[PDB]
Amino acid sequence: DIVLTQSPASLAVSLGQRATISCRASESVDNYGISFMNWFQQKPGQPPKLLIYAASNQGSGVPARFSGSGSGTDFSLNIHPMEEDDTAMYFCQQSKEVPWTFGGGTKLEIKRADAAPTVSIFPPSSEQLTSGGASVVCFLNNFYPKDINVKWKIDGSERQNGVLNSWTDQDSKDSTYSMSSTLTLTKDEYERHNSYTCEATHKTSTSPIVKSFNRN
Amino acid sequence: DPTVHWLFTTCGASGPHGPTQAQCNNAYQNSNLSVEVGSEGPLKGIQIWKVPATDTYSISGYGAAGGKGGKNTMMRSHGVSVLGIFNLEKDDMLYILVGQQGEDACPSTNQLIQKVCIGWAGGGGGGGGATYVFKMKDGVPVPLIIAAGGGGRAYGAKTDTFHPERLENNSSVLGLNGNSGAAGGGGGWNDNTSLLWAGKSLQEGATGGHSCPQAMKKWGWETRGGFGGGGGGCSSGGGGGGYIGGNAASNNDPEMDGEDGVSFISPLGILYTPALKVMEGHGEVNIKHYLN
Amino acid sequence: VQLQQSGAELVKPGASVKISCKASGYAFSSYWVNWVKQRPGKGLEWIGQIYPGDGDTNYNGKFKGKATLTADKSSSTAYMQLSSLTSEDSAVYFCARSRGYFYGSTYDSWGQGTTLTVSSAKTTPPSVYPLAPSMVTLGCLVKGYFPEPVTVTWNSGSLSSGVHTFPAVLQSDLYTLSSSVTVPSSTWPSETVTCNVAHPASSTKVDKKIVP
Ligand SMILES: *[C@@H]1O[C@H](CO)[C@@H](O)[C@H](O)[C@H]1NC(C)=O
Ligand SMILES: *[C@@H]1O[C@H](CO)[C@@H](O)[C@H](O)[C@H]1NC(C)=O
Ligand SMILES: *[C@@H]1O[C@H](CO)[C@@H](O)[C@H](O)[C@H]1NC(C)=O
């Protein structure tokens, strides 16, 4: 295959600013004087939309702030000035040789000032154990940037196995990110220990943020 | 009222398919012309008129031009005009198919092809449809005036030279399709089309040819024939529709224009002047009362 | 120019589906029709293409005999049949038209997508568990349900300026998600607010009060 190395996988940009996305091919995609590199935008729940074909040519009704550059093995998608409505996935794509292949994509998101997570922990409801099992839930809300690590503690000792995490997409109103981490044990394991704590590590602080509770 | 003029057009339509009832109702609103337009089958794009009085009428058919080849500077092959005088009887139904221009290869909305157009397969123009005026008698169609369309121009056509107009007035001659090669020949009056790029005969619906798969599978330069009978385009130009469709080259020769179609005038009617290439776009039919 | 795809499919492992792509507004027999697979957190995958004029096909070797591409000129419809289905086949599948070299051999018109879900588990209604502990944060736990669409609201929707609903996770063939709402301590517990959970596939609506 002709492999496309798209970079970066994520990119955050202030309104008005320049966004540059790169696509590098393992072999030339030039043939017949044409470069068979193409660029696409895809928003959630929609099919992709063509932005740039043959490396340099605007697609129909694609605003001027989008522009494509390159030839051979190196190519670039530039957006400038950035507008709110440009947050999406972006893909490069070659048609020079079968099989046709896509780049790995770039998620374009809005940049904002850093913010520390608000952390909250919640004990199991009596309802849940009455059916068997015990889920403890920790929310890590409204933080930026999106990279974070969550660590559960049991009896002072770390626990990560049996835990499921879920991340939200960027908020369109706050520009922040949230995640839920939920540890599911059986009721025998829950009732075998007393105190349960959740700790988050974010670049915004050097000391983890901590919430805890003990059974009653 | 003998001052009345009925002008038949494409009702706004272009390309290999003809118009809908709703297009002609829009184009003819607030006029003396009212028509019925088929929705399905071989009569789909064809307009049906009712003759208002027993009298002698002028009928002038104009067929459609073929498309341009590979250069914005080329002239098109203009559609043929055929002018006749006919006696018609109140309540006769006339069936009218107005030919549509062959697809131009230049100009192009693709800025990569436009580069070529201003200074391998696919630069040749499409064939362009003939114009048909016929009537039913005993369930079998009978032709009155067929104004052939103009053959499409080759991708690398160098001279604006065209052949003299051909006119037949003899039903015993079969109205067959022209030869197809890489480019589609023109649709005739009654034939069995089976290739995708050849123009369809009138009694098949006269849909204009697809462009050649040599072009469309690789480079994507699309030049289709016109309603009705226009042959599809390749490097070679496509043949125009007629009673006999114009021939297309046997190979994909880029210097070989599609031929115009053969026109037809009923011998029971009176021809007014020799057939003549004049139409630079779509076709047209004009019908008036005749002063004698 | 329009490509219109058939509806979603929910099938058991081992089954087959045939997804349809009905073309209009252009010459079906003159353009390639491509198929593309998209899963969450993954890019796009090209499956193969077909040229309806003469049945020519090109495949991505990864999908040979898994996908089978065909075209029907009578209806101007392109089909993709997926065989011997597994959970790795669960995805959104698009059909797309491409143009020739002058257009960069790229896609220019996409179907709306078709969602395939492959699972061996039968419809199960969600279980709802509350989440109890200046601003106070509250929660609603919606665990163990199938299939996927669920909707969480707070106070019938009227109290929703600050809510976060987290994407669902897959556990033992069932889904679980959580929702959060943060409100001033001057409104809770002094006022009651309730999460409303709906799972239409099981025709379910449940309200749960947040008890201290
Ligand atoms: C019909 O034709 C007559 C005579 O040519 C003309 O006076 C009249 O205006 C035409 N109809 C319409 C709607 O104009
Ligand atoms: C086309 O095929 C039909 C088959 O019934 C045949 O009758 C006819 O003579 C052929 N030629 C024309 C001009 O239709
Ligand atoms: C005019 O009328 C005469 C007498 O009927 C006829 O011989 C002649 O052919 C007519 N002319 C036209 C052009 O119809």
Side-chain angles (χ1 to χ4, degrees), chain A residues 1-129 132-216, chain B, chain C:
Chain A
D1 301 22
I2 295 180
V3 170
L4 299 183
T5 304
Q6 204 178 331
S7 52
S10 297
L11 179 53
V13 173
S14 299
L15 293 177
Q17 185 52 299
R18 170 175 300 285
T20 307
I21 299 174
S22 291
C23 195
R24 192 191 191 77
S26 65
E27 346 176 348
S28 169
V29 300
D30 303 327
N31 213 25
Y32 304 102
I34 300 169
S35 288
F36 289 90
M37 173 61 49
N38 311 281
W39 290 100
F40 297 81
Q41 178 192 74
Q42 187 183 39
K43 293 182 171 181
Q46 300 179 352
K49 179 182 167 189
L50 175 64
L51 295 176
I52 300 290
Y53 74 93
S56 312
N57 303 102
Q58 298 287 114
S60 190
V62 170
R65 67 180 176 277
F66 299 90
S67 63
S69 176
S71 75
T73 65
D74 298 320
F75 303 92
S76 289
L77 173 70
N78 284 264
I79 306 104
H80 178 84
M82 168 83 181
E83 306 189 1
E84 296 193 35
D85 182 74
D86 299 344
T87 56
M89 290 289 315
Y90 292 84
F91 292 98
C92 48
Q93 183 264 336
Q94 67 87 18
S95 300
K96 197 252 181 172
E97 185 192 279
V98 166
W100 296 1
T101 51
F102 296 102
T106 300
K107 184 181 273 195
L108 184 53
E109 291 171 291
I110 299 181
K111 176 172 182 192
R112 56 148 292 156
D114 294 343
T118 301
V119 182
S120 301
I121 191 172
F122 296 97
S125 316
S126 63
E127 284 95 328
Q128 186 179 195
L129 285 65
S135 290
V136 61
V137 178
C138 191
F139 294 161
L140 308 191
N141 285 119
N142 305 97
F143 64 84
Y144 187 103
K146 50 181 184 159
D147 288 357
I148 195 161
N149 189 21
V150 60
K151 279 193 175 299
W152 290 94
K153 293 169 71 80
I154 55 171
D155 294 332
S157 177
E158 72 95 13
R159 178 56 182 253
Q160 194 179 345
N161 179 294
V163 175
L164 288 177
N165 300 323
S166 178
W167 291 267
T168 58
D169 204 352
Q170 192 170 44
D171 184 341
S172 62
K173 186 265 187 186
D174 208 358
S175 307
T176 53
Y177 299 85
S178 296
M179 80 172 281
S180 75
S181 193
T182 299
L183 168 65
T184 300
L185 308 174
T186 187
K187 172 183 74 183
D188 288 343
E189 282 206 7
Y190 174 68
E191 302 187 341
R192 254 91 180 141
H193 315 279
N194 189 26
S195 191
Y196 291 88
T197 301
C198 175
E199 299 191 1
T201 39
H202 192 219
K203 74 175 280 293
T204 189
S205 166
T206 183
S207 302
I209 300 175
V210 300
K211 290 291 180 285
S212 61
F213 63 77
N214 48 10
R215 306 176 58 207
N216 49 10
Chain B
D1 202 352
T3 60
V4 180
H5 182 200
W6 305 270
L7 168 60
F8 298 78
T9 71
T10 48
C11 309
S14 317
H17 311 279
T20 74
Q21 189 71 75
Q23 287 177 296
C24 292
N25 287 342
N26 171 255
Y28 300 154
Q29 182 184 5
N30 297 321
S31 77
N32 315 94
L33 180 52
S34 169
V35 301
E36 177 183 357
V37 178
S39 145
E40 191 170 345
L43 271 54
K44 178 181 190 181
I46 300 180
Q47 305 171 50
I48 310 180
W49 184 56
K50 179 189 264 182
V51 181
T54 311
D55 201 351
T56 307
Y57 300 81
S58 340
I59 295 177
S60 66
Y62 302 81
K68 277 175 184 316
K71 286 296 166 293
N72 279 342
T73 49
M74 288 179 209
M75 172 166 61
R76 294 177 184 88
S77 182
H78 300 319
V80 176
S81 67
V82 171
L83 276 70
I85 308 180
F86 287 84
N87 291 21
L88 299 181
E89 185 176 335
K90 174 163 152 64
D91 298 335
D92 295 338
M93 293 300 191
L94 279 193
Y95 296 80
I96 289 168
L97 188 170
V98 187
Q100 289 172 196
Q101 188 204 285
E103 181 157 35
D104 297 328
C106 298
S108 194
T109 177
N110 178 278
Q111 288 312 303
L112 215 149
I113 300 173
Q114 176 74 344
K115 278 175 66 177
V116 177
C117 286
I118 65 192
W120 164 268
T131 293
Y132 299 80
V133 178
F134 62 101
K135 81 181 174 187
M136 299 285 173
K137 190 165 77 181
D138 291 340
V140 56
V142 185
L144 301 200
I145 299 195
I146 304 181
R153 302 285 288 163
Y155 160 73
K158 256 70 99 173
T159 78
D160 294 349
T161 57
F162 311 115
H163 295 184
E165 291 95 339
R166 298 178 285 180
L167 181 64
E168 181 74 44
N169 68 336
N170 174 222
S171 314
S172 286
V173 182
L174 300 188
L176 312 175
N177 292 350
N179 295 352
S180 302
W189 166 260
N190 188 4
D191 200 281
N192 303 310
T193 321
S194 74
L195 296 175
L196 221 42
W197 46 100
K200 274 67 191 172
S201 74
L202 181 89
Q203 276 160 16
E204 290 177 293
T207 294
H210 291 59
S211 196
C212 64
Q214 287 176 70
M216 289 309 281
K217 277 184 92 166
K218 296 183 153 204
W219 281 90
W221 200 348
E222 194 176 5
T223 43
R224 293 190 71 172
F227 199 66
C234 214
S235 293
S236 299
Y243 181 79
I244 298 178
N247 285 337
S250 56
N251 50 7
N252 196 29
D253 177 4
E255 285 181 341
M256 198 76 48
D257 288 348
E259 298 185 335
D260 306 336
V262 183
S263 308
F264 185 96
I265 172 68
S266 168
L268 298 191
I270 291 170
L271 186 76
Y272 179 69
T273 169
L276 185 70
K277 302 171 70 62
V278 297
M279 271 298 213
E280 322 176 337
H282 293 322
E284 199 179 66
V285 185
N286 292 271
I287 292 183
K288 305 185 202 67
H289 289 265
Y290 178 81
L291 183 53
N292 193 349
Chain C
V1 173
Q2 290 175 269
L3 304 172
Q4 180 159 16
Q5 293 181 226
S6 55
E9 290 293 308
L10 173 62
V11 307
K12 287 185 178 297
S16 293
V17 293
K18 191 177 203 181
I19 297 169
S20 65
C21 180
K22 178 175 182 65
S24 58
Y26 77 92
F28 183 68
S29 285
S30 297
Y31 292 80
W32 291 87
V33 182
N34 304 261
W35 292 89
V36 173
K37 175 179 179 188
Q38 108 158 317
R39 294 182 282 172
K42 299 191 166 62
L44 303 163
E45 289 195 82
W46 181 80
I47 292 169
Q49 60 185 8
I50 181 163
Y51 187 79
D54 61 11
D56 202 355
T57 55
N58 292 120
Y59 282 86
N60 180 2
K62 179 179 174 165
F63 294 89
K64 276 185 185 161
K66 172 63 140 189
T68 301
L69 305 187
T70 53
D72 174 12
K73 287 203 223 180
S74 64
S75 67
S76 292
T77 300
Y79 298 94
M80 172 175 74
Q81 183 178 257
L82 298 169
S83 314
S84 300
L85 291 173
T86 73
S87 64
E88 287 310 284
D89 295 319
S90 295
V92 173
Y93 294 86
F94 296 96
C95 62
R97 181 179 146 237
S98 67
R99 302 181 289 198
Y101 299 167
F102 279 123
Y103 305 88
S105 285
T106 200
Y107 322 109
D108 80 323
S109 195
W110 295 72
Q112 85 276 23
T114 300
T115 304
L116 181 57
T117 304
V118 181
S119 172
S120 241
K122 286 287 176 182
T123 307
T124 301
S127 184
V128 180
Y129 302 128
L131 302 171
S134 191
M135 300 294 176
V136 56
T137 59
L138 303 168
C140 195
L141 181 56
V142 183
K143 186 171 178 174
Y145 69 92
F146 186 93
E148 231 274 85
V150 165
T151 62
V152 180
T153 59
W154 292 94
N155 290 4
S156 303
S158 70
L159 181 159
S160 287
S161 191
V163 304
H164 291 238
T165 296
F166 299 83
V169 182
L170 180 64
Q171 175 169 274
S172 62
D173 295 331
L174 291 89
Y175 294 94
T176 297
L177 62 79
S178 303
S179 186
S180 74
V181 64
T182 300
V183 301
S185 186
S186 169
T187 69
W188 185 82
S190 303
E191 294 294 341
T192 59
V193 302
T194 60
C195 52
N196 321 114
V197 184
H199 187 244
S202 297
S203 294
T204 300
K205 285 193 173 111
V206 177
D207 303 338
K208 176 67 175 178
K209 276 77 66 177
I210 50 173
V211 61

